């Protein structure tokens, strides 16, 4: 069955959407259209993200969908059937969640991998490139797959780096090393 099994809270919806669009072949189109309706939802920030709140009727939810595919009509029909499904199933509290999940499945299908370089400060571009190079060089990025390596700032990790991707991490930070050191000097 289609790659990557993400069991989620309505991530079964995403899985279904994914598998459904694989059998329709056009996943990229679907993903793009899903991005567009997500974008116009996001760009209807008040009084359209506040209509993701559960208080609307079944009939009113249905009319919210009809208005949504009206709202900037020209959307794939598979995501309009999905929109209907989510409304009918009266869940839309994981709508952008489903979108994000469909993206993960899609870009997994595409082959793209994500990494992370947590630090307490933005690191050199030389560092960004060097790590991207290193990972690409190693089997860690298997190739036939790409790495969008993202440095993030979290002061939680004071100094160093932690490289993350594929649930494989290497953490050389001052905080973690300090922890182990402290413990050994508390022994």
């Amino acid at each position: 069955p289609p790659p990557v099994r993400l069991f989620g809270v309505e991530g079964t919806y995403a899985t279904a959407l994914y598998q459904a669009a694989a059998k329709n072949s056009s996943i990229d189109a679907a993903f793009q259209s899903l991005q567009k309706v997500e974008s116009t939802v996001k760009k209807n920030p008040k009084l359209g993200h506040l209509l993701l709140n559960p208080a609307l009727s079944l009939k009113d939810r249905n009319s919210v969908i009809d208005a949504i595919v009206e709202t900037h009509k020209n959307l794939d029909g598979y995501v309009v059937n999905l929109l209907k499904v989510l409304s009918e199933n009266n869940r839309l509290g994981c709508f952008e969640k489903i979108a994000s999940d469909f993206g993960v499945l899609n870009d997994a299908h595409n082959g793209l991998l994500k990494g992370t370089v947590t630090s307490a400060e933005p690191l050199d571009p030389k560092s960004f490139k060097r790590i991207e190079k290193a990972l690409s060089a190693s089997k860690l990025v298997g190739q036939g797959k790409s790495l969008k390596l993202e440095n993030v700032v979290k002061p939680e990790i004071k100094g160093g780096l932690i490289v993350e991707l594929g649930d494989k991490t290497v953490d050389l930070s001052i905080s973690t090393k300090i922890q182990k050191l402290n413990k050994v000097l508390e022994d």
Partner: protein, 62 residues
């Protein structure tokens, strides 16, 4: 790396700590010498006790 930094920093920057023997003394028991090497007391000198004893107990054999 960080191991070296800490190792270096700690080792170099501290290598003396307080240590006064006098403060230790307060927390330990003092040695002081035994008392009373007293020689035993001598008693029941003379046959005065014996003569008294032979007489004293009427029953010397019954």
């Amino acid at each position: 790396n960080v191991i070296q930094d800490l190792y270096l920093r700690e080792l170099k920057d501290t290598k003396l700590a307080p240590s006064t023997l006098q403060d230790a003394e307060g927390n330990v028991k003092p040695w002081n010498p035994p008392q009373k090497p007293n020689l035993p007391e001598l008693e029941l000198q003379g046959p005065e006790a014996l003569k008294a004893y032979t007489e004293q107990n009427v029953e010397t054999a019954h």
